[PDB]
Structures are given as C-alpha cells and as structure tokens.
C-alpha cells in the first residue's frame, strides 16, 4: 500500500491499452467488429462504407 | 461508349454491378465519372 | 403458399452453386443484406432458411 502512487501509474497505462484493445470488438455501426467478416462477405462498392 | 443491350440488363450499365454483360462484354470502372444514358428503342431495332 | 401461412424450407447438409441461382435471369430482382450475391459461393452457413 506504501507504493500506491508508482503501481497507480502502471495500472493506469495497462485499463487505457486494455480499453484501446477492448474498442477493437466495438462495431461503431458496421456489419461486424472484425474486418475480415465484412471483406470475405461483401463486394468492394458495399465494403467501403 | 455506344451499344445495343436488353432492356432488364440496363442495370449493369453502373460502377461495380455484377452480371454477365458488366462482366465480360462491357465493364465500367469501379469509380466512373460520366453520365449514362439508355431508352426502350424497340421501334427501331426489333425485327424477330 | 398464400403469405398468411407463409412456407419455410430449412435448407441442411449440402453444397449451394448460387452462382447458378444469381445467373438465373428469370429472376426480376436478387437484392441482399449483409452480403454482397458474388460472395455467396465463397462462405459457409450453420443453417439456411428458404
């Protein structure tokens, strides 16, 4: 509990990279979070958007 | 560009449409600028 | 059938050309959701649903 200030920072810095890889899997309104789904099932003109 | 083509096949006529005609008779670019222009002339080329 | 007993045809256990189905000119209009009708030959499905 002494080091609170020094394991805060590293905790920090591992919910922040861990939030960024997390927002990976968030479809923000596409077909799908992987990208991989969308160009093996749509054409290029329909994938784009 | 100019051609003769059947009427339900028109669609074709666009950037990135499928079909047999888009495919291998006439294909436009994915990313076409221009302006396309089709009518029903069945009064002057029909004749079977 | 009339649409207020619409049919279902689970469709199971086999190979699908819709190639075959998409060159099929007698069909008026072939709209689809999701994926693209060129795409259709290339993927694989837990169940289909006619």
Redesign the interface.
């Known amino acids: 509990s002494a080091l609170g200030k020094l394991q805060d920072v590293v905790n920090q810095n591992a919910q922040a990279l861990n939030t960024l890889v997390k927002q990976l899997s968030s479809n923000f309104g596409a077909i799908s979070s992987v990208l991989n789904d969308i160009l093996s099932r749509l054409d290029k003109v329909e994938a784009e958007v | 560009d100019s051609f003769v083509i059947r009427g339900?096949e028109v669609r074709q006529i666009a950037?990135?449409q499928?079909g047999?005609i888009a495919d291998y008779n006439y294909k436009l670019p994915?990313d076409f600028t221009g302006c396309v222009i089709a009518w029903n002339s069945n009064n002057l080329d029909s004749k079977v | 059938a009339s649409v207020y007993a619409w049919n279902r045809k689970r469709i199971s256990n086999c190979v699908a050309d819709y190639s075959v189905l998409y060159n099929s000119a007698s069909f008026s209009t072939f709209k689809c959701y999701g994926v693209s009708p060129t795409k259709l030959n290339d993927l694989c499905f837990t169940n289909v649903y006619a």
């Open positions: 339900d950037p990135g499928t047999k994915d």
